Ligand binder design. Structure first.
Ligand SMILES: [Zn+2]
Ligand SMILES: [Zn+2]
Ligand SMILES: [Zn+2]
Ligand SMILES: [Zn+2]
Lengths: 401, 402, 403, 402
């Protein structure tokens, strides 16, 4: 009844500022968050203690996390997560190698997203993949990405929802670079080849993702913010914006509204960068809230794909997924509880005083009560009690790995 | 019960469940005053968006309007240019008597007062140097102004029963590539020693020094830098002023608090929101404001910290700016007072970083709002946005005629 | 020509020849890279609607000629619409080529190309901090009109001078504080620019460019015309893209963006300036990023698709000096890039010989380029060194002083 | 040769600005650069790029090839893990004997040695805390290791007749949101006081403390912050280590030199090039390297500054890395020595900011290169890029057999 009592007070409070809490919960059910598989086994693939060591364990881990996160979710898979009794050369992956993932997804009412894996491989050892000067190596990655599109399309055909396939490459140089041009020219041509095969948009979407820098490649990144904004606008692919991939102080929240005027869809990777593209777990913080607000304010339900893109191996992995996913949903909920029309109007009239005042007052409205009921409705713990389940799971299962 | 009472009860139970006493949190919140900056009221004009105050009366009226909408203890932070004299007073000769009206009004309004010498917007500050000026007479004038200022400050402490913290900030610096960064710093070091040489009663006055990374037109070099003043406060044992808008991009004063406190006796924390630069925007209930509050409370700094606003936004209603900033700082302090610190510290000490991260994040969805609203109600101030209405009324009635 | 200069020059010639660099070719290539000097630095951006600033067209031209005789090689003048000359006030939206005739004439007599810019600031109708993106249709149309009119002046310049005029579009639009709707103003801006560029003009006479800004004082939380907004704009509409060196995030550098943008937009306008803690608009120095920008232009053989312009404003020192220092530094950075054995460095890089690449790049810094710069100055009847400052001081004494 | 012709021309150009090229060379010889031993073996110690050194002989051999290609005075900065023992030695039990071969070689090569306790890559540093570890036993182990290291350092000074600057750097910090930043800082401060409690001869040994903003896997909080160590160095009077790669984006140590020097007795400058992080890339002849050099020379810091390299690049030839970095620091120093500082200073003092800027910029095209090349010739070292050929040949002959 505590939870129910708080919910009822909240419902009246929000009603007073024109916000319907029941409607906000329904809208929250329209915003899946795509969970990254790679957090479960430290990006190992199948080619703090307790990491998953195979597909079965990764799925068991995912299910434990899923039970503690309310509402819709998707699973974002990397190519290295294929399941084949025999080894498969990247450039020859096929839908059958992801059949188990597909059946599981169906059983769990999940959509699946995908990504070619252009890293941790003999052919990525020089720090170039798709922009590699060597024609054969370059062809090898082009072929891997072409094959991955087909896997992506298969996901969409089987599951009823298009699979967003994100393209990210580590390509770049550690130190002062003489020719930033040639590798970009090669990248441009290669991607063109990559997306040449027309696939059903109902099942598949191509996205491109930039990075400012990587360890061991901090002086130059072939696929920069500008290179990709140019690519996405000119070839009409989705553009992926990564909250941890930009300059210090640089925010993707601002970029949403500018990019949407030129690209058909956006993929938002949320993560927390700390002193660098550190990939820390998403918190309910200023920038995560700004991203959620931009999504909801512009009614981006059908053109935005929300995903987690962090990696922390210093804490329980299941907890990392839980904490991050719940935070992203809490930020979306708060955005949905905003009296946007009222604020836009005040802003349109130059009432900047009221605008700031009311934005700040929203922070002390009882949104927590609404979140707790959302959890209850999805039979998920409303508060810290979820950690107990993770603890129990660690004791029974993970401790034995 | 009223709805406020019902929500409060709920919250009370919810927090008692994590070992937090909501009534006590409210009591502790009263030990943390926030010093309002007088200069936001008249665009730093002094008395030497429409509606700015034009004289002391107006400024005091405006302050009263903001204070009745801000719950709990407050202080007023005054600048030397806010003296009230019938005749002009050279800066180097101000006296306590030039701040009598301020003192009488602070007494009547249950406010402590803080002070600052005004080392800018003056013929003698035109070269961009004051206390570090190469010219002896110019340098002496600022030294003298600062010394006189300390006596005004001690006077406030003597009269109001709480020490006045007198912050020293100068604009000194160079816009472009500088050849000699040393000599201005040597002169600065010597000047301040001179400035703080008259020993005053610590029960009435405290000296503080404040760095700044850069300022428009003094962008390549600042005489009084962070290192300069951390060395100064540590070696001279003055208070150190940390300003949330005065550092490098990504740089945070919350981290600095526990480090500096091991070397300096007291800390003056200036909150403001830097936006793309040392812009001085109104303080929001955001990550860093919360971080600041959390360090204060976590390290039990009640008796060694002095909290004040330091921003200036003349694009919105001035009274609203003070109300928003002050209430935001109090909200952050209250959330820190509601943290189950002991438990978190224990998990952290055990290396349970999973539970520490989880529990920090779960604290964000605990019902601190009901506690805040009760705090406002008990202090006879609006719990929500209704305060805006008071401001608007005041604007129609009084501000619109300025 | 003194014997010392000639001697230093011949030693440098050999030295460079030894790394496969022809110094004479470098100077010829330097003559193909004009630098567009910004007119606004001469009068503090006052327009015609530290002491000694110019107060009108005549004074501005005289000040520019003093700067010009101290800067070697090709130059252009970048004019703002507020620099128009007419006996009586002209509404911004009604400006005409005739209002710029004396500029055109002066440019012909001085062998200068001319560049242009609509002026969307310092005006009653920009007071709200919105111009091309203003929600008010009338205000919006005023600025669109001002922009379409400006294109005509630009085209005229190009028709008259025989070199296309690059016309850069920059607006201050944004919000100081937390913003609710960043989309609407961007939608309006997109539409407004489409209207602005609707009239087709002769590309041999005119080029359109768009310039982003990260943040303006008073407009710090949101900038309508952001980097992404214009990158999408220029790619999609095929206008030139303007990259401003003071305009971005901390540690963010236009040198890296050059090669990315050029794959998508037809031309690039590079505005060089030095940000100091902010878009402070300080004078260009021969420093790491000015050199990085020069190297990118030269390495990629961008002679014909790049337009190099200064864009800073420093009112604390002598103005003529500011233009001289800035322009001379841009040219020196260009010359150093031209003296680089790029093909050899490129080949080492291609081989993964990063050791040799770093080493040689660093050794170039201690090669005698100074002698090459001094010869370029001498051939162009400009001071080789510090002596130009005397010229400046003399002019101050004689002219600026009396202002 | 052309070298000398070029030199003569330069001698004249610089004599015209009041600068004596011969005096510049003599002064350069008064500025040693402390090369970091760890660049040669990837910080492995003896407890992409091929050819790394694998033991003391190899590293010494490698250091020798580098030294022949770098003109002028140099020193070697050693880490405790570079001890030479036939058997394992617990870090807390190192002795002078364990570094005797280093001492002897140093004597022979006319080198001064600097030192550092190694509080990383060890089972007892695995939790990310060392001197600030809450476990008393772990903390003691590190305190003991640092105490023993001081004795090693004093030994070097005693043997070589030049003080060994022993730099204290710890990785201590937390990767994520931290609850208590105070407690580890209190432990660190006490720990350091113990560490430096044995008095040693200042002519043989100097203690230095080094801050860090963040470390990979310790990004949220660093126990030994800039303010922490500025307070420590000022209050305990140790040297302060300023690292060019350890601060916030856009933050520069060049500015800090003149501020810190008013409070601490000596400064250790660690030059390196951060790229997006403390990437420890090779020092370039660039803006900040030049700015640091300029501050040292401008303030005549010969005796109170210790210049060292602190970068680590494993992607290119290691010898080349040392050569480029050391030559680069030296070139920056030379340029600073060729600056007409007095004139500049006098312009600035007069407010002639036009001439100051103008002249600062014209120095960049003055023929300093001919002066650098002659410095190289005078020290029997390659003046230009030929040195690479020497490294190439050593790689061929030597670094290939590894
Ligand atoms: Zn991502
Ligand atoms: Zn302050
Ligand atoms: Zn520009
Ligand atoms: Zn260091």
């Amino acid at each position: 009844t505590q939870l129910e009592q708080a919910w009822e007070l909240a419902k009246q409070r929000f009603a007073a500022v024109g916000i319907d809490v029941e409607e906000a919960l329904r809208q929250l059910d329209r915003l899946p968050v795509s969970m990254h598989c790679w957090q479960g086994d430290d990006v190992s693939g199948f080619e703090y203690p307790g990491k998953a060591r195979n597909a079965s364990e990764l799925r068991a881990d995912l299910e434990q996390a899923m039970r503690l996160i309310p509402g819709p979710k998707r699973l974002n898979l990397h190519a290295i997560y294929l399941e084949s009794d025999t080894p498969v050369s990247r450039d020859q992956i096929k839908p059958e190698h992801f059949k188990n993932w597909v059946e599981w997804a169906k059983a769990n009412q999940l959509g699946l997203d995908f990504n070619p894996s252009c890293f941790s491989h003999p052919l990525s050892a020089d720090g170039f993949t798709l922009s590699h000067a060597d024609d054969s190596i370059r062809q090898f990655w082009i072929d891997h990405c072409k094959a991955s599109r087909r896997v992506s399309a298969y996901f969409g055909e089987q599951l009823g929802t298009p699979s967003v396939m994100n393209i990210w490459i580590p390509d770049g140089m550690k130190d002062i670079t003489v020719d930033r041009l040639a590798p970009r020219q090669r990248l441009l041509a290669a991607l063109d080849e990559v997306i040449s095969e027309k696939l059903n948009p109902a099942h598949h979407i191509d996205a491109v993702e930039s990075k400012l820098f990587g360890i061991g490649a901090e002086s130059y990144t072939v696929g920069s913010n500008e290179f990709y904004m140019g690519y996405a606008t000119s070839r009409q692919t989705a553009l992926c914006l990564d909250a941890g991939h930009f300059h210090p102080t640089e925010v993707i929240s601002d970029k949403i509204s500018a990019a949407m005027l030129y690209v058909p869809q956006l993929l938002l990777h949320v993560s927390r960068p700390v002193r660098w593209d550190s990939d820390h777990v998403v918190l309910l913080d200023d920038e995560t809230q700004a991203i959620a607000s931009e999504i909801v304010r512009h009614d981006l339900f059908d053109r935005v794909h929300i995903g987690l893109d962090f990696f922390d191996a210093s804490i329980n992995r299941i907890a990392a997924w839980v904490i991050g996913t719940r935070n992203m949903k809490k930020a979306l909920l708060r955005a949905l509880l905003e009296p946007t029309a009222e604020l836009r109007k005040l802003e349109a009239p130059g009432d900047y005083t009221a605008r700031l005042a009311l934005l700040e007052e929203q922070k002390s409205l009882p949104w927590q009560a609404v979140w707790e009921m959302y959890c209850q409705r999805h039979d998920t713990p409303a508060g810290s009690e979820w950690l107990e389940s993770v603890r129990a799971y660690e004791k029974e299962i993970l401790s034995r790995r």
